[PDB]
Design a protein around this ligand. Structure first.
Ligand SMILES: C[C@]12CCC(=O)C=C1CC[C@@H]1[C@@H]2[C@@H](O)C[C@@]2(C)[C@H]1CC[C@]2(O)C(=O)CO
Ligand SMILES: NC[C@H]1O[C@H](O)[C@H](N)[C@@H](O)[C@@H]1O
Length: 373
């Protein structure tokens, strides 16, 4: 839904499929914890490796990313992702996501100019020769890099790095949206959030009254509220009924998303939503292995497009996503609402799904069980 987004849009179902398989996988390996990551950022970091991959290494990357090579060209995927990053990262554009990919490669290996140029042009890759036999100084320099790159918002990407690391793939992304409809800060008050409930925490609960996109599904036992950001990003806030999270996790896919957005309608309501911040920080190898991306991690990797020899493999891929949510920030037609409008209060665990409306991509997937962690 942006026309400049032509190449990016060809990617829309494949990226959404990947986004939600990844989600299904990760909620299994960690069933009662905060989950927070950037699908678009993971998809983008891996497609970028595909630039340098050959044969079955390459085919597994692209397929595990949910592309079917018999129906889409490799040219189009890279064109797609270049168009996507360009739109998400562009200053004049609707998101300013500032999502970043970096590789840290052992000084003991060669790099091809062809890979460095292709990956810079397409994917804005920064690549660093790294002496992993100085773990202390490697760690400190990598974390300083993430810190400086994120204007302070993300620090401590890596800790205790194997001195035999061949290549670290880093993707990281910080976001704070500006709300199309701001919450009034005078009315934020600490209220109770029900984690367990053997557990209960106090959270600053924001408040706003007004017309918001809303939908209830009975099938899933979920209240859906959708809030726009200024620009083109939008947030779906999904409140499952007590006892219905496991079920929502196991079903959630892009068809569920399309159902929701097809059926949202503006409803006047009292909205209570926590002011909070969340990080997710993962080494994502297993998850991707389980999704069928195998050889890239093993000695059977063909990354010869990177080094010019079949000597490279991905030792470690760290993904860190970070988000702040608060009240901020910035007429002639106003509804005459019913006497006792509904109240929706996100005060028990919920999903937060952040998308771009210009490229129809999933920017963030959050499962918030405890907004004070
Ligand atoms: C699932 C969906 C439609 C089917 C598909 O294969 C890919 C997606 C993922 C992104 C979704 C999209 C549509 O639903 C419209 C959405 C929600 C979009 C993100 C932003 C969006 O354009 C809107 O929020 C407009 O309401
Ligand atoms: N198949 C074409 C596509 O993939 C290659 O690996 C090239 N290096 C890149 O520039 C191009 O867009």
């Amino acid at each position: 839904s942006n026309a400049e987004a032509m190449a990016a849009l060809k990617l829309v179902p494949n990226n959404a499929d990947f986004a939600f398989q990844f989600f299904r996988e990760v909620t299994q390996e960690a069933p009662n914890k905060n989950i927070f990551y950037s699908p678009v950022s993971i998809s983008t970091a891996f497609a970028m490796l595909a630039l340098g991959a050959r044969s079955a290494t390459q085919s597994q990357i692209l397929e595990g990313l949910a592309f079917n090579l018999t129906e889409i060209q490799e040219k189009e995927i890279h064109e797609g992702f270049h168009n996507l990053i360009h739109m998400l990262n562009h200053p004049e554009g609707g998101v300013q996501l500032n999502m970043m990919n970096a590789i840290f490669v052992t000084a003991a290996l060669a790099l091809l100019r062809k890979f460095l140029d292709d990956a810079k042009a397409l994917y804005q890759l920064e690549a660093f020769t790294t002496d992993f036999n100085k773990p202390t100084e490697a760690e400190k320099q990598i974390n300083d890099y993430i810190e400086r790159k994120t204007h302070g918002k993300i620090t401590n990407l890596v800790k205790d790095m194997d001195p035999q690391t061949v290549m670290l793939l880093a993707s990281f992304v910080y976001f704070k949206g500006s709300w199309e409809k701001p919450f009034e800060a005078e009315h934020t008050e600490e209220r109770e959030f029900f984690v367990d409930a053997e557990t209960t925490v106090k959270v600053p609960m924001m408040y706003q009254m007004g017309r918001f996109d809303f939908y209830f599904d009975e099938e899933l036992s979920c209240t859906v509220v959708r809030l726009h950001y200024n620009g083109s990003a939008t947030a779906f806030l999904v409140l499952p009924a007590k006892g219905k999270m496991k079920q929502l996790e196991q079903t959630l896919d892009k068809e569920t998303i399309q159902k929701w957005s097809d059926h949202l309608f503006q409803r006047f309501m009292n909205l209570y939503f926590p002011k909070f911040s969340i990080s997710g920080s993962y080494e994502i190898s297993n998850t991707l292995r389980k999704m069928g991306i195998v050889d890239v991690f093993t000695n059977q990797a063909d990354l010869s497009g990177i080094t010019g020899s079949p000597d490279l493999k991905v030792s470690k891929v760290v993904h860190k996503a970070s988000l702040d949510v608060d009240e901020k920030g910035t007429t002639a037609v106003e509804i005459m609402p019913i006497s006792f409008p509904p109240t929706i209060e996100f005060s028990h665990p919920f999903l937060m799904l952040i998308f771009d409306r210009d490229t129809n991509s999933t920017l963030f997937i959050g499962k918030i069980v405890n907004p004070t962690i």
